[PDB]
Design an enzyme around this catalytic site. Structure first.
Site, mmCIF file in Angstrom:
data_model
loop_
_atom_site.group_PDB
_atom_site.id
_atom_site.type_symbol
_atom_site.label_atom_id
_atom_site.label_comp_id
_atom_site.label_asym_id
_atom_site.label_seq_id
_atom_site.Cartn_x
_atom_site.Cartn_y
_atom_site.Cartn_z
ATOM 1 N N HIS A 180 -34.966 33.876 55.978
ATOM 2 C CA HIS A 180 -34.932 33.027 54.780
ATOM 3 C C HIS A 180 -33.647 32.229 54.701
ATOM 4 C CE1 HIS A 180 -33.091 32.473 50.803
ATOM 5 N NE2 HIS A 180 -34.279 32.083 50.384
ATOM 6 N N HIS A 214 -37.630 30.663 46.802
ATOM 7 C CA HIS A 214 -37.035 31.809 47.508
ATOM 8 C C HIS A 214 -38.065 32.747 48.149
ATOM 9 C CE1 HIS A 214 -34.053 34.945 48.307
ATOM 10 N NE2 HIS A 214 -34.816 35.810 47.664
ATOM 11 N N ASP A 230 -41.597 37.573 47.611
ATOM 12 C CA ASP A 230 -40.274 38.213 47.675
ATOM 13 C C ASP A 230 -40.411 39.730 47.729
ATOM 14 O OD1 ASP A 230 -37.380 38.068 47.688
ATOM 15 O OD2 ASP A 230 -37.321 38.328 45.531
ATOM 16 N N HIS A 274 -35.079 38.451 55.082
ATOM 17 C CA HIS A 274 -34.115 37.741 54.208
ATOM 18 C C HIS A 274 -33.038 36.995 54.998
ATOM 19 C CE1 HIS A 274 -35.758 39.447 50.457
ATOM 20 N NE2 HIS A 274 -34.951 38.602 49.843
#
Ligand SMILES: [Zn+2]
Ligand SMILES: [Zn+2]
Ligand SMILES: [Zn+2]
Ligand SMILES: [Zn+2]
Ligand SMILES: [Zn+2]
Lengths: 365, 365, 365, 365, 365
Positions: B257, B271, B171, B254
């Site tokens: 994602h 995540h 992340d 992101h």
């Protein structure tokens, strides 16, 4: 605070140094009390005596029982007094040399130390490791004075088992990292003050010399032979590391070595081999960068020094045993408190386990 | 335009921080409403309560049902009102912490967040991810205020499963690349303006810290232990990445994602693991040079982050599924439009497939 | 052994920021008590009030008498209570902003600070410098909380006298050297623990930004105009230096500044100008290399900061006056004891005199 | 002597360029004669016609028989005359585009070339390779004018077999080395004089782009997809290599390619694949340093270009066949005489055999 | 999202190029309409006509009145029609060449431009600057087609006043910075799309060539003589800068140049001299680093280009005049909006004043 550096009066090194040192010894005293174990007395004792005789120096050789104990010191002193000898020569390994230092101290006599092996940096120090007759550690005697002479016959040292020279490089590898940690911490050394730049520079030279010369030396030592790489490494192992630890400082690596002596599985390992791993633990402890960890791992693997707990004989009950090693490392009076940051038994346990995992990955790559 | 940076009032980190934060918490409020799930309440809840009590702070602990939903928020608020508590503490994972933020917002109370795992950069943000009771995503609540305190007990975090810390590094690895892409694009952040140099510099430090410290940290985390490399990585994962995304910006990684959440095969991934691959897709998208692609691939392989579609569970029907992931990535409102060039669903599809092929070749070399 | 970093909730910077901050302020409170001296109230007060009104925020503006004293705080609090205002805004210089912080603290209200000049790094800190009504220093009030907002209108700051921006760069130049000295010393900061890497990194960025942008900014400031170099320097002077000193640490430079306040000849110099010389004294004190001394000397000469005692108004009785400055520097509680080595009044006297001679030679070369 | 550089009037490149080029084409002529083979006419012909129609341009599409022969040119010209079309569009591979150039030349009409594959640097040149109807080479027609437009639809090119794009990189890899050899030799180019720095700089950029982008492009091309690495490589392969060879110069590599056409075993290889090996032969010929040889070998192996005689189908009778290839290379009029030193058939034979042995060792390492 | 690059068909450069270009011109047309002012017609017109005659090309020479106006174009077209000439040659300065382009456009004829001075990068562009008969600017005519030939006789150009070649280097110095700013901004060029790498690479080569060759060229030009440094600079000034601005893009520097034309004190300065200062203003605007500002300042001072407002004739009423120049710079349609950040009339005013102060300090150091 004062900056202090101490040194032995003279340090001699080269081929046939054990038969050439009489010129300088003659000026220290007119007679010498020479000690060695039976193995060393036959190997190098008879040559040393003949050489000292050739410079007109009176001698009495006496047998050493193999342990640096208060009882043994007092036994040899009594014989020294009977002959009236004006100096002391020690020939052989650590326990012999340390007993010669004690005799010189208590009798106020000059001391010559002649290491036949290059496996520790003790020979130059004003230090003796005192043991009981049974062989258990008792205390340290720190002297005001270093040995008056240190004589390194590299023809004799070259013929010693290669493992001993490698253990010497393991003891020497720690010198820069502990010296530099004491320098950053502003920690007092055995010399009695802060580090001079001289002592710290020699600490660093020790380390750069191991990396430059360590492998060329080991192979010469493997063959039983004298090259100038071996000469550089013998100096690194003895003079550079010796001035380095005593006048710059000890820190985590040697405290962890002392922590490991509580485990009987490590008793087969030599002093410097345990220090080599302890240095690796110190790198993880002070968070040295990865390429620095890799140069030390690379050096250790290449020469034959332990980078994992398993190579030191610790195979089972790791968590509990490393916790105990960690507590004994952080005991009051230990040199780990010379680090420039807070150390706890938890963070030494942490460092040792992570270092082990760094060494496993490295050996398996 | 204005440059804006926001931050939590105080960020604390070290051994035993969950029992030492009471000194600072005392000045925020005279009493606290503490929430955690049953697992976390037994692990770290009882210590936190005892520590807050020792600084003379009144407490009521209450059980959290495991989901950050509007229903759950309103249930806990009702209990908070009944006890009249003047602050909110959340202990545990993301959903617990986000619920503590919402409660603090709606009641106008100070918030303390105590992550027991270092797996996301959410803890410092003025953000909550709201879910339905069933577990489907509902909305984002962006707050005016960041948490008043963020407390990272690295002794507790070290003992969490290693995979979670690695997902945290995944992340965090995205932060520099998305921040820098928003900086080049002159794209607005959640803070509300352009990036300060401060926020972008910390974004970059995040990335350099992962490369320097990531491996040393992972092994310490593997052993369950606290080293200073883990401390650096926990800060990278939490403070550096957190300020980085919120005040510098999110971008392609992101958005991708979020595109991958449409595939049920990816629901087993955390995540940050999906973000690590999404970062790799962003590098191919912005045409970063090969040695930059190789440092990220090398980092990901070494720590255990996915560099191929297969490692994310996508094994069949690739063309159709990546096309669907590409469309959902470029949806209106997504952060991929913060890139400094035109992005289309075709060029995200392209990047994902090429990135996959870069990761296959890398793993097979 | 906790690492701590603190920050103001939000930091805003750009053209017209004093009229654009209402959006964010609205979420802190429904009404604000605004304070400023008469000069600042006419210059920027009327615009701030109109802007806050445009976001539907109720206001009462009140005059500030010019001194940050306990009497003045209590006088303004009494008026605040009468109007029932839910927040505090300070507009103007250091004494105005510090009084707004105190009012916010004692009333438990949110604080907005709007510096019209970029001459210190105080604005972001949880600190007020308290004076008597006559203007003598009384004490420091350290708060639990930083200002909730810091608003830097660079159009207003650009038009301030150039000397003030240069004094701000002098205050900021010290941040890296004192931060780094506390980091090496493992010295506690005002935040309450050791330094995070975040805070130290921003300390370093402060320094690199001054060298990169300081000259381009000064010339823009000379013209009265806003360039992106000035924007970078305003951030360096305010956010980067502010986080740097409070959460990384103060050390020799600021202690020496406090030492110089005993000499009346230095009272014409601003805070940061004295700090610039104090930084030079710290470099000689910690024995920084010559090239580093020369970059700082070069920076100071170029921008217009004092590098010699004569440029600070000390021309006569140097030996005795510097001895007195040296004693007051090493007083118990001063930040010079955060250096990573022993400091004595003799060695601060030494450093100041040698620094002076370094600056003379530099100016005459 | 004069320095000369020539170029096509406009070069267009991007997604959907074959449907977007009508805006620029409209200004060249009010109607166009469009040619393509049946495969290409169905794939991209119908879209091109619809796009040209949408910008109000009259068209007649006609079928191309697959060979660039004088007979075929005259057949299509006759149909062009009957319809009265004011321009010529070629869509497809090399033979189609070259026939469109000839038609434009003989009729004094503007030319648009739309390569559907990026496998040669011919498209931009004022050159047609003329063949007999049976398929044997006849002559070269060099024109005064380059194509008026070159249109590269990278969505269409991406979907072509990967091998063709790789052959294009092989043709482009030679450009810097032959350009630079003509520059050093002061050899005349097809443009008609010495090289401009412009043309030589683009020759070098071609080479650096292959090394930087070649691998990222090949994998995107493998997937059938458009990335910015493919866009860079398509430009390298077409514009950079095209200006490079025509206006800077050809030399050994392309002469050796022509030498290899006498061996029927090489007829299965594409133009650029043979040039890639010919470049390797040129490096040994001009005695380029080893690390330069290794970067080219490394590039070729990695992308899939031949570095050995065996990979080009020459397995038996090597000495005699390479001698014959060497003679035909040094024939009067060949570009190898543009090298900056004396070349003989013996020294080309030498270079080819040594290059082969360099490639064998490289593939076996 | 197409990338576009355009170019003149052929660019010729060297000694006696005006008498050697007939070979290539013969293939464009069988006859040419040649225009020049009386000064240029006697200097180089008679040689050009004799050379074109020697390649069997029919000619009619006609006098140019000195202004590129619609009236003048239509007057010369009428004479062209009467003689039935199949091409157009312009010989001389910018206004002559631009009129030859217009004639070629409206008559659908090939164009040859033969600049006798190397002071702008206009010659290669598909652009004419149209003026009224009185000499006031009217409009720009952008053509679909670049000149078919550009012929640079460096023996003639060398003998032109040195100031003109220096102004040409000032125009060329801007090319990299404006091109690179359009590339970063993703701004459309006159070619009609995004920049190719080709065009941007040549933009950069322009800049590196000025720094490498600019001084050696100026001294050769001072002597009236042709060296290869002058040849490199003539190519930089004409081909490299020309492709650079048209196909990569214009930005702040040229918008500011247009802003300065409102001040009558600047009317004595040539196009490129004002662009050189405008480039300096752009560097302060985009916040280029100091070392980059210093290389450009150093270049400008050394060759004789203005780095201060005073060197451009602006001595009084600076604040008001620069404000007016700043407004006219940011007018709708100006190229400053191609910068990769927000530009306002305040921030252009700022940049110009700070740039001036940078140039003052530089000249006085
Ligand atoms: Zn030791
Ligand atoms: Zn995330
Ligand atoms: Zn200060
Ligand atoms: Zn070719
Ligand atoms: Zn221009």
């Amino acid at each position: 605070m004062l900056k202090v550096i101490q040194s032995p009066g003279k340090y001699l090194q080269g081929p046939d140094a054990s038969t050439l040192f009489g010129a300088y010894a003659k000026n220290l005293a007119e007679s010498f009390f020479v000690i060695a174990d039976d193995f060393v007395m036959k190997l190098a004792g008879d040559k040393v005596l003949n050489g000292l005789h050739s410079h007109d120096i009176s001698l009495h050789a006496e047998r050493f029982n193999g342990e640096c104990s208060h009882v043994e010191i007092r036994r040899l002193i009594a014989i020294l007094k009977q002959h009236g000898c004006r100096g002391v020569v020690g020939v052989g390994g650590g326990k012999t040399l340390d007993t010669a230092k004690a005799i010189g101290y208590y009798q106020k006599l000059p001391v010559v130390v002649i290491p036949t092996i290059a496996s520790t940096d003790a020979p130059t120090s004003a230090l003796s490791v005192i043991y009981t007759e049974a062989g258990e550690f008792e205390e340290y005697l720190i002297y005001p004075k270093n040995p008056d002479m240190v004589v390194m016959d590299t023809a004799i040292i070259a013929k010693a088992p290669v493992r001993l020279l490698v253990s010497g490089m393991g003891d020497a590898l720690s010198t820069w990292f502990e010296a530099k940690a004491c320098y950053d911490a502003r920690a007092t050394s055995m010399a009695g003050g802060q580090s001079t730049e001289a002592a710290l520079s020699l600490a660093r030279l020790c380390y750069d010399t191991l990396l430059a010369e360590g492998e060329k030396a080991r192979l010469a030592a493997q063959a039983g032979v004298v090259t100038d790489a071996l000469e550089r490494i013998i100096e690194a192992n003895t003079y550079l590391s010796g001035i380095g630890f005593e006048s710059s400082g000890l820190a985590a690596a040697h405290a962890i070595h002392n922590g490991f002596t509580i485990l009987e599985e490590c008793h087969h390992l030599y002093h410097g081999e345990k220090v080599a791993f302890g240095t690796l633990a110190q790198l993880v402890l002070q968070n040295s960068p990865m390429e620095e960890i890799e140069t030390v791992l690379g050096f250790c693997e290449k020469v034959g020094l332990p980078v994992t707990l398993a190579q030191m004989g610790v195979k089972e009950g790791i968590d509990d045993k490393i916790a105990a090693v960690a507590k004994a490392t952080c005991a009051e009076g230990e040199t780990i408190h010379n680090m420039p940051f807070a150390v706890t038994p938890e963070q030494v346990h942490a460092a040792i386990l992570t270092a082990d995992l760094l060494g496993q990955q490295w050996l398996a790559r």
